[PDB]
Design a protein around this ligand. Structure first.
Ligand SMILES: Cc1cc2nc3c(=O)[nH]c(=O)nc-3n(C[C@H](O)[C@H](O)[C@H](O)COP(=O)(O)OP(=O)(O)OC[C@H]3O[C@@H](n4cnc5c(N)ncnc54)[C@H](O)[C@@H]3O)c2cc1C
Ligand SMILES: Cc1cc2nc3c(=O)[nH]c(=O)nc-3n(C[C@H](O)[C@H](O)[C@H](O)COP(=O)(O)O)c2cc1C
Ligand SMILES: Cc1cc2nc3c(=O)[nH]c(=O)nc-3n(C[C@H](O)[C@H](O)[C@H](O)COP(=O)(O)O)c2cc1C
Ligand SMILES: Cc1cc2nc3c(=O)[nH]c(=O)nc-3n(C[C@H](O)[C@H](O)[C@H](O)CO)c2cc1C
Ligand code: FES
Ligand code: FES
Ligand SMILES: [Ca+2]
Lengths: 446, 204, 408, 251, 198, 387
């Protein structure tokens, strides 16, 4: 329905063959600590303690009431802490199947459940941590209520799992989740999907809008900027579709639903495909026997925006649905920058690669060139379909200004939205951290 | 003794720390002696205006104090212009309007208001002499460079033999234009700030 | 001569015509009326100001001595005043000190406000509220080498209303004090004779005021006790003038009369159920001894206490007869002390070195509830700088650490 | 009271300031006018060639030798008037005392012309040796003025000094260069057909030419300004009839 | 009317006060922090110059020109004080009239008026006008052109210094030095029109 | 040398932060590609200067005076020693060598002095000595007349690098075109050496006006080449046989060089389109109005395109990424402005016979105002919540 013109697709080899196959056994699950932006934990477990599924692990100091639950039952083994004793990951060892049961419901009553009961059930089950507000991408406080729940039912990240295949196996659960969201929203529920067909909710609160085009069309930021512009005085909530499935199954069966479907793909994957696992799964265990020999890098989340998961961070993120493995490169090539490379990709037409339409590249992690001052040759303006001024906004963010950025429109953005901007930067900057610091300052000053 | 005379020379120079009073300094320095005459005029006018204002500060009509200082400064400036026209006609021809610009000059108005209005006449006169010296320093040491590199002359005395007279130096014609004075003042204040680090401004 | 008189009369007529127009503009168009302001909504008293008068000047003339030390220029920022009605033109100077946290209600700066209309104020009751007590000195004994414990009694046996951690202000008139008359016992004569502080002398010609925290918890009625250190010149520049008010306090002897002005305070203790950790050094004993006695004798709190003090030697230590008894009486309170460099005469058998090193090794290194506890810090700045640095290194937020630097 | 006190002090200050400033301004008018006359006299004497130094010497030499007059442009004959205190600039500025030129004839681009003109005769005895004609015309960046010292014959130039111009120094402001000013001696103004013969030759003129003069290197626009100035003020619209009368005699 | 438009264009670009005659730089450099502040002070300067020059031409043609009021007496030595006083009073009256009658218009210009009531730029314009001997309408057009040219200069410099938020100025030159340097380059750029015959 | 490794090699770093994949483009590639696009223009400029020198010499002199001239000046005897010929039948190789003996010293001096200033500043400020200077040096070497004394070029490049680029903080921080600041310092400091008739044709004793100055004096019929007496045709003035500066003589070579960078996305086509449309509109308006004294009023747009420095300016020099406007509408307006200013200065200013550089210096000031206006309108549209 809405056509995005400016945008960039990433032709990186090793697309996942969209056939669900049962993934390898997993024995360690964990919760990351850094990605829950603005959360300082108050611990509730100690090394050696035994917990069950959906049991409380810790709570948030500056966001009271919210409880983060243990994905699987077992025994706590490792509590890693980094510099300044900041929490990194709470490691749970898989053992047994004990859990905690919750109230059940029928399908018909789902559309008329009370907001207070829904909030209490979601918070106690721990699934409430799925919602990310805008601005500031923070988990919503237990009492607030928005006017639009954005259900991201489409994915356009590189090597991303196809949502249609995953949803078509859980149609009843998706219907239940949409009914619950329509009862909770206090307003409208926008579900953004491609041209294909998805299971339908009968409530009149649910609106279906269709986006078409390159990568920036599959993000809550773009959905919101095009359908319900977020401001400092008008907040909206975003939730990925598998969390909707989990909500539906939770309200239908009375127990937490911890399954996941992630796309294990990349340049150095022997056989890319969809695998079935539990959130927080140890990528070290999951990637066994699926990788070619050589130095490699495990990335939770897409190659555009992800976390270098080696060590305490080697665990699948809460808000991530894909695993990308790509080959590391440390070769200093003579005349590499001036070599008219056939295999050197560029959105700019400055290389012979763009002549061969449809080519697939064997990408690496090298950063061509080094850090230099940004010279706006006109690259940011090709990859921002939003009605924002990219060249001015990026200079403003780099200058450290805060109120000017807020006026310019830095509120709608997020960490993952500037991924293309840092991807195309001639100066090889990283804008995610700059935007995060600016948003932190804006939130802290008032 | 006379520490107040040398106090405003560098610590609080009116065009280095303060910004007031550059309209003359921007365009009267095309020659050295015109700037010298302007500096002497500023000294005399500032000193006498501070003297008289501090004399009359007790019975001031505070509602029109600005008008009263402007009246006294006009009475001084018109007399100065008359004397310059009568005895220094050749120099007064070059100055033209800028000798009349002294009436509105920010340094003299600010020193009449801030210090003369609330101070004893002798300190008022001494402070006027001091800031006149501080202003004349930058006038002399901008005019020196401008005249030397625009005509190879000083006070009309020729130093570098010009090409047109069979010498070896060619006059850089940019020094007769304003941007040369702008750049000279900028590099000068950079030198002053790097040799007196205490005046460095913050990033914000 | 004809030109001279003609020019003179035309000059006079011109300036008179100009000034009459200016006066007509400034007298027939501007309100020329007095302005009325209200200090608070509830009281009926209203302060009369002028359209051309500044708010700070008007308050000073009316006698409302709001916080101010410069009168303008943004040097201090103490002139911030709460309002409930006023103009929307916020000056850049006001905005420099007023962030968006205060811009929601739009409070202004007193030295930058001109009352052009009938606005209202919302000043705190204390803005116009303070007290005073002519306190007779009972004793000024020496408990440390460089610290005198002054003891003051409020007349009529009226205990001042204050909270543990407050500070009084003491006024000192112009006087000259030699250091020859100070009473220091033979125990502390070691350092003074070596450094020869007796040859100094103070010189104060104008009244001054300073702040000093109480050393007594409120249930001790009718006693104002402090721990005042000497503000001696540093051993690097002996020619600098010495401490003005500190020389005055040390000069105060038993039986003399002194004046104090009202209980103040901002360095308080939070009302929670979390562990309290007190860390002390130097003359920071006066504030801490107040709270520990407060939570143990007034509130009878059951929470976990711990107090840590650093000292140069065993002759700099005091008050522990109360502290040892407090630890003996109560199980919640456990105290420890450490000396920087001990002397062979003390026969010290205990913790040594800097206090931040001591508290880390013994307690914080093996603690299992890091950050979960509150800390109270007061003393010399370098002790303060080290402790905040390590507490940040152990990962504690700024809300839990609550320090009190004695004027930098 | 307050208002009366303010009025009284303001009036008193106005009176004292007025009297001092008026005395100061009245005292020096004669000296200022003398200085202006001295400047003009020095320029004219340097044009003529009579050496002079110092105010008194300049004054006595000018009063002994030079003798200002007035000339009517239309008929080229002397008129009666205060030749000493004439102001051709303001006379041309006045709408009543100056005609308006047309775009066809205004070669010099001055667009106005005073109705009465001024010259400066040089006299050594009863006779006349030189006649000096003030001329002006538009250059490139500003107005330009000069005196041209014509011999008593009516065709020979004996000097030229550009006493007011604003061209770029070194490149266009070469008009004051003595090596260029001395180039005008011996040259002639009118040909054998009494037509304007002065011509600035681009690229340099042959030495000892009848009516040539070297152009300003890299300054052809200022050269054209000078050429237009002379070609206009030596035509019939300018000093033409007066120079014809000089050639006839009676000077 | 070719003459009025030509004079407007001349007073706008060919004779820009702040970058061809170089006056008013104390305020020019200090106010240049904000684009909006510079625009407001520029509108104040132009609205001042709409009336500062015409009334001065009236006064000069009426009572100050040589032998204008009585034959044989010249009164040209009072021009300095008469000009400064007249401009000051005539802008004070306008400011107070706007404040009393149109507060919405006054808030846009009264912030800068008490500080620029007397300045270098207005006096320079008045003196140059008196030197050039305009008429009443030509004076009005000259003021309305020169003021807008000054406003254009200050607005452009403010925009440049706003764009300077990205530059790494050396510590010694931070602030005043870099302002003077960039004003120099701005004048270098503005030197283009100096030769136009109009 | 050790420092040559930083140029001949890639850094070989790995993505440390979140965005693990980066594009292959970089500042070194951009600047080197621009430095490799003016090569046709410069390789034609050398030959053109050589041909003009040969034509002027063999028109002015003949016989033994040729030997007298070549023995005195150094370029001619250097060419003869290297194996060329000064006769009327000089081959293209000899013409190119004679042009090179003029172009190369200026480039070497500019490079050495500018590199000295760059290295000193970047060593004091401890920054990484970056690229960009390769473009600046070659541009300032290409926009100067052939017979510039070397010290004037050194002073010009010192000004344009220190007072305009380095003092602001280096590449990406400046706001005025550095090469143009240096050229303007030279232009307003020594006008006798960068303007007139004696400078453009690199000969001894040859004075002749160039193509633009002739039209202002005598209309289209005055476009005559004094060296041979043949009228200058549009094909000549477009293929680059005119006597002019050393860089912009050949519009065709400039277009061939600029096509690759424009197609490469390095130079924004919006600026070029704005310049073209502004120049066309102003030329058409002036032509329609017409005049009977200022004959430049009737020069059509197609005659305006190839004359002077318009081609070089618009293609390689107005398209500076760091000084131009940043928003797209700002770029369009900026191109319009420089085109209009160039035509206006060309037509209605008699002192200067060309104004592309002055137009660029003027519009560099007003580009940020354009971007601010556009961004303020965008902010208004955003506060309206519908965008
Ligand atoms: C809320 C609060 C509570 C406080 N509680 C206490 C308390 O309980 N006990 C306590 O001891 N203090 C306390 N203080 C600190 C208080 O400021 C003391 O009065 C302090 O010791 C200053 O002493 P003074 O006024 O005698 O010396 P000051 O005159 O204020 O300063 C003297 C010091 O400055 C140096 N000095 C003086 N003149 C110069 C000069 N021209 N150049 C350089 N150096 C110079 C001297 O060498 C000496 O070190 C408290 C402060 C606050 C704000
Ligand atoms: C800064 C500058 C100032 C100039 N000033 C003048 C000048 O005042 N008078 C003049 O005739 N030419 C001046 N010129 C040169 C002319 O503008 C023009 O370029 C040249 O004279 C035309 O060639 P030609 O005079 O040899 O025919 C100046 C040139 C420049 C660059
Ligand atoms: C980008 C650029 C800008 C130029 N700007 C000017 C200028 O402003 N003034 C000038 O006299 N010559 C300028 N020139 C040089 C002219 O193109 C030319 O050399 C000279 O002006 C005479 O022009 P002509 O040879 O086309 O007749 C510039 C050249 C270039 C390449
Ligand atoms: C397409 C392009 C054109 C450039 N043009 C110029 C130019 O005309 N002058 C210059 O000094 N630098 C030029 N540069 C170099 C650089 O961008 C410029 O100097 C910056 O403003 C940094 O000083 C150019 C660079 C590119 C990529
Ligand atoms: S700016 Fe010139 S005197 Fe104030
Ligand atoms: S009282 Fe200090 S800034 Fe106002
Ligand atoms: Ca004139």
């Amino acid at each position: 329905m809405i056509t995005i013109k400016k945008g960039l697709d990433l032709p990186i080899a090793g697309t996942p063959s969209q056939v669900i196959s049962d993934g390898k056994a997993i024995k360690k699950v964990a919760l990351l600590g850094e990605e829950y932006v603005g959360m300082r934990p108050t611990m509730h477990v100690r090394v050696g303690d035994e917990v069950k599924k959906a049991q409380i692990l810790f709570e948030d100091k500056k966001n009271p009431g919210v409880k983060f639950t243990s994905p699987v039952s077992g025994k706590v083994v490792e509590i890693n802490r980094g510099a300044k004793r900041v929490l990194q990951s709470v490691v749970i060892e898989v053992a047994g199947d004990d859990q905690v049961t919750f109230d059940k419901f029928e399908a018909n009553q789902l559309a008329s459940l009370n907001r207070d009961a829904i909030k209490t059930q979601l918070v106690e089950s721990g699934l409430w941590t799925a919602f990310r507000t805008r601005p500031f991408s923070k988990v919503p406080a237990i009492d607030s209520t928005s006017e639009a729940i954005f259900v991201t039912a489409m994915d356009t990240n590189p090597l991303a799992a196809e949502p249609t295949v995953v949803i078509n196996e859980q149609s009843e659960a998706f219907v239940a989740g949409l009914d619950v969201l329509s009862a909770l929203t206090t307003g409208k529920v926008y579900v953004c999907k491609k041209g294909t067909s998805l299971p339908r909710s009968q409530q009149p609160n649910v609106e279906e809008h269709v986006f078409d085009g390159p990568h920036p069309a599959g993000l809550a930021g773009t959905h919101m900027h095009f359908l319900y512009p977020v401001s400092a005085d008008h907040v909206a909530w975003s939730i990925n579709y598998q969390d909707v499935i989990a909500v539906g199954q939770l309200f239908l069966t009375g127990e937490l639903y911890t399954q996941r479907v992630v796309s294990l793909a990349g340049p150095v994957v022997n056989k890319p495909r969809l695998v079935r696992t539990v959130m927080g799964a140890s990528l070290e265990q999951l990637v066994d026997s699926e990788i070619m020999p050589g130095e490699v890098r495990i990335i939770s989340g897409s190659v555009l925006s992800g976390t270098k998961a080696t060590g305490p961070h080697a665990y699948l993120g809460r808000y991530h649905l894909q695993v990308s493995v790509l080959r590391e490169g440390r070769d200093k090539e003579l005349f590499g920058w001036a070599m008219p490379g056939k295999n050197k990709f560029s959105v700019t037409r400055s290389f012979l690669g763009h002549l061969f339409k449809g080519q697939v590249y064997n990408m690496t992690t090298t950063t061509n060139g080094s850090d230099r001052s940004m010279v706006p040759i006109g690259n940011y303006e090709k990859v921002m379909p939003l009605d924002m001024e990219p060249t001015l906004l990026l200079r403003d963010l780099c200058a450290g200004d805060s109120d000017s950025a807020v006026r310019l429109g830095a509120l709608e953005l997020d960490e993952e939205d500037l991924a293309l901007c840092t991807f195309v930067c001639p100066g090889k900057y990283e804008y995610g951290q700059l935007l995060r610091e600016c948003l932190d300052k804006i939130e802290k000053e008032g | 003794l006379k520490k107040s005379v040398l106090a405003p020379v560098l610590d609080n120079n009116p065009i280095a720390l303060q910004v007031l009073g550059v309209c003359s300094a921007l365009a009267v320095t095309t020659k050295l002696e015109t700037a010298f005459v302007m500096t002497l005029a500023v000294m005399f006018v500032t000193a006498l205006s501070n003297f008289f204002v501090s004399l009359i500060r007790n019975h001031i009509p505070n509602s029109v104090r600005i008008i009263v200082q402007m009246a006294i400064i006009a009475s001084l400036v018109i007399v100065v212009d008359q004397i310059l026209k009568a005895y220094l006609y050749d120099i007064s021809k070059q100055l033209s309007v800028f000798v009349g610009l002294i009436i509105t000059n920010c340094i003299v108005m600010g020193r009449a208001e801030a210090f003369a209005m609330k101070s004893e006449p002798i300190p008022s006169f001494i402070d006027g002499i001091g800031n006149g010296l501080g202003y004349g320093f930058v006038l002399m040491t901008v005019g020196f460079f401008r005249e030397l590199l625009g005509s190879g002359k000083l006070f009309g005395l020729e130093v570098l033999p010009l090409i047109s007279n069979g010498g070896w130096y060619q006059p850089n014609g940019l020094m007769l234009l304003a941007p040369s004075a702008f750049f000279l003042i900028g590099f000068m204040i950079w030198a002053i700030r790097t040799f007196k680090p205490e005046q460095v401004e913050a990033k914000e | 001569m004809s030109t001279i008189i003609f020019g003179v009369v035309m000059f006079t007529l011109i300036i008179l015509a100009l000034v009459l127009v200016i006066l007509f503009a400034k007298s027939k168009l501007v309100p020329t009326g007095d302005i009325t302001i209200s200090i608070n909504g509830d009281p009926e008293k209203a302060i009369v100001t002028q359209p051309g008068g500044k708010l700070l000047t008007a308050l000073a003339g009316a006698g409302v001595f709001v916080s101010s030390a410069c009168g303008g220029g943004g040097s201090c920022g103490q002139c911030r005043v709460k309002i409930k009605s006023g103009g929307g033109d916020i000056l850049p100077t006001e905005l420099d000190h007023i962030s968006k946290g205060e811009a929601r209600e739009g409070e202004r700066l007193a030295c930058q406000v001109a009352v052009k209309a009938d606005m209202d104020l919302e000043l705190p009751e204390e803005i116009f509220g303070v007290k005073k007590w002519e306190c007779t000195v009972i004793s000024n004994d020496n408990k440390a080498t460089f610290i005198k414990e002054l003891k003051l009694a409020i007349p009529d046996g009226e205990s001042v209303p204050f909270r543990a951690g407050g500070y009084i202000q003491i006024e000192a008139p112009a006087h000259h004090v030699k250091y020859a008359d100070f009473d220091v016992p033979e125990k502390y004569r070691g350092d003074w004779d070596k450094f020869n502080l007796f040859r100094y002398e103070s010189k104060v010609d104008e009244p001054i005021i300073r702040a000093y925290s109480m050393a007594n918890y409120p249930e001790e009625f009718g006693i104002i006790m402090l721990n005042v250190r000497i503000a001696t010149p540093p051993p690097n520049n002996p020619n600098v003038p010495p401490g003005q008010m500190s020389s005055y306090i040390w000069s105060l002897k038993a039986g003399d009369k002194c004046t104090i002005s009202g209980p103040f305070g901002e360095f308080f203790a939070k009302d929670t159920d979390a562990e309290m950790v007190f860390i002390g050094g130097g003359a920071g004993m006066a504030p801490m001894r107040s709270h520990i006695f407060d939570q143990l004798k007034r509130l009878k709190s059951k929470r976990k206490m711990s107090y840590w003090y650093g000292a140069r030697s065993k002759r700099e230590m005091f008050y522990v007869e109360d502290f040892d008894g407090l630890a003996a009486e109560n199980d919640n309170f456990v105290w420890h002390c450490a000396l920087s460099d001990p002397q062979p005469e003390d026969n010290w058998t205990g913790y040594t070195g800097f206090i931040h090193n001591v508290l880390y090794e013994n307690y914080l290194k093996d603690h299992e509830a890091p950050e979960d506890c509150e800390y109270y810090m007061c003393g010399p700045p370098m002790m303060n700088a080290a402790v905040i640095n390590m507490l940040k290194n152990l990962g504690v937020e700024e809300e839990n650490i609550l320090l009190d630097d004695f004027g930098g | 009271d307050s208002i009366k006190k303010t009025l009284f002090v303001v009036i008193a200050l106005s009176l004292v300031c007025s009297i001092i400033v008026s005395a100061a301004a009245v005292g020096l008018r004669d000296k200022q006018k003398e200085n202006a006359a001295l400047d003009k006299q020095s320029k004219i004497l340097q044009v003529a060639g009579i050496e002079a130094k110092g105010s008194k010497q300049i004054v006595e030499l000018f009063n002994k030798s030079i003798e200002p007059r007035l000339v009517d442009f239309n008929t080229g004959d002397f008129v009666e008037g205060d030749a000493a205190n004439y102001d051709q600039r303001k006379a041309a500025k006045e709408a009543s005392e100056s005609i308006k030129l047309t775009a066809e004839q205004d070669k010099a681009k001055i667009q106005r012309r005073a109705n009465v003109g001024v010259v400066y005769l040089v006299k050594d005895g009863d006779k006349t040796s030189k006649v000096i004609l003030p001329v002006h015309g538009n250059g490139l960046w500003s107005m330009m003025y000069a005196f041209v010292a014509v011999e008593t014959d009516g065709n020979t130039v004996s000097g030229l000094t550009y006493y007011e111009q604003g061209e770029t120094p070194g490149l266009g402001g070469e008009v004051e260069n003595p090596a260029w000013r001395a180039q005008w001696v011996g040259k002639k103004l009118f040909d054998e057909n009494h037509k304007p013969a002065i011509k600035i030759v681009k690229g340099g003129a042959p030495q000892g030419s009848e009516h040539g003069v070297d152009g300003l290197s890299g300054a052809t626009l200022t050269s054209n300004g000078v050429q237009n100035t002379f070609d206009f003020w030596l035509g019939d619209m300018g000093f033409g009839p007066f120079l014809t009368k000089v050639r006839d005699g009676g000077l | 009317m070719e003459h009025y438009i030509s004079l407007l264009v001349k007073s706008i670009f060919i004779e820009n006060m702040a970058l061809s005659f170089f006056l008013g730089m104390c305020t020019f450099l200090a106010v240049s922090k904000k684009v909006k502040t510079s625009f407001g002070l520029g509108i104040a300067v132009i609205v001042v110059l709409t009336i500062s020059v015409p009334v001065n031409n009236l006064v000069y043609n009426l009572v100050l020109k040589p032998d204008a009021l009585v034959e044989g007496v010249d009164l040209s030595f009072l021009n300095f004080i008469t000009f400064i006083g007249v401009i000051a009073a005539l802008v004070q009256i306008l400011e107070m009239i706007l404040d009393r009658f149109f507060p919405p218009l006054y808030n846009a210009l009264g912030i800068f008026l008490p500080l620029i009531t007397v300045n270098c730029a207005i006096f320079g314009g008045v003196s140059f006008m008196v030197q050039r001997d305009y008429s009443f309408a030509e004076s009005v057009v000259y003021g309305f052109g020169s003021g807008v040219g000054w406003m254009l200069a200050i607005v452009a410099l403010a925009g440049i210094r706003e764009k300077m938020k990205y530059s790494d100025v050396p510590p010694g030159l931070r602030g005043l030095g870099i302002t003077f340097i960039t004003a120099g380059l701005m004048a270098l750029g503005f030197m283009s029109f100096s030769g136009v015959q109009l | 040398y050790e420092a040559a490794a930083t140029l001949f090699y890639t850094p070989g770093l790995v993505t440390k932060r979140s965005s693990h994949v980066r594009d292959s483009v970089d500042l070194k590639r951009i600047m080197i590609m621009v430095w490799l696009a003016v090569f046709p223009a410069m390789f034609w400029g050398m030959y053109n200067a050589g041909g003009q020198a040969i034509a002027a010499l063999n028109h002015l002199y003949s016989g033994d005076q040729l030997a007298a001239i070549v023995a005195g000046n150094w370029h001619y005897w250097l060419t003869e020693m290297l194996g060329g010929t000064m006769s009327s039948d000089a081959g293209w190789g000899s013409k190119m060598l004679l042009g090179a003996t003029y172009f190369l010293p200026i480039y070497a001096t500019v490079f050495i002095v500018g590199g000295f200033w760059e290295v000193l500043f970047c060593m004091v400020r401890k920054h990484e000595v970056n690229e960009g200077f390769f473009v600046t040096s070659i541009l300032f070497a290409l926009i100067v007349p052939p017979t510039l004394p070397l010290w004037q070029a050194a002073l010009g490049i010192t000004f344009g690098v220190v007072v305009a680029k380095e003092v602001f903080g280096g590449t990406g921080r400046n706001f005025l075109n550095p090469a143009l600041a240096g050229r303007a310092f030279l232009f307003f400091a020594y006008p006798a050496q960068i303007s007139g008739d004696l400078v453009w044709t690199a000969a001894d004793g040859y004075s002749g006006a160039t193509a633009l100055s002739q039209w202002a004096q005598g209309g289209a019929g005055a476009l005559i080449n004094n060296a041979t007496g043949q009228t200058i045709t549009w094909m000549d003035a477009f293929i680059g046989n005119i006597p002019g500066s050393i860089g912009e003589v050949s519009t065709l070579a400039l277009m061939i060089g600029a096509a690759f960078i424009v197609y490469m996305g390095i130079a924004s086509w919006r600026i070029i389109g704005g310049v073209m449309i502004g120049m066309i509109l102003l030329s058409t308006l002036f032509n329609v109005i017409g005049s009977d004294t200022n004959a430049m009023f009737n020069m059509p747009w197609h005659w305006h395109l190839v004359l002077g420095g318009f081609a070089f300016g618009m293609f390689f020099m107005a398209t500076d990424p760091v000084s131009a406007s940043f928003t797209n509408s700002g770029k369009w307006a900026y191109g319009i402005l420089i085109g209009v200013m160039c035509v206006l200065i060309r037509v209605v200013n008699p002192a200067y016979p060309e104004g592309m550089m002055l137009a660029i210096l003027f519009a560099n000031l007003f580009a940020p105002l354009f971007d601010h206006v556009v961004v303020e309108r965008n902010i208004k549209r955003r506060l309206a919540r519908y965008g």
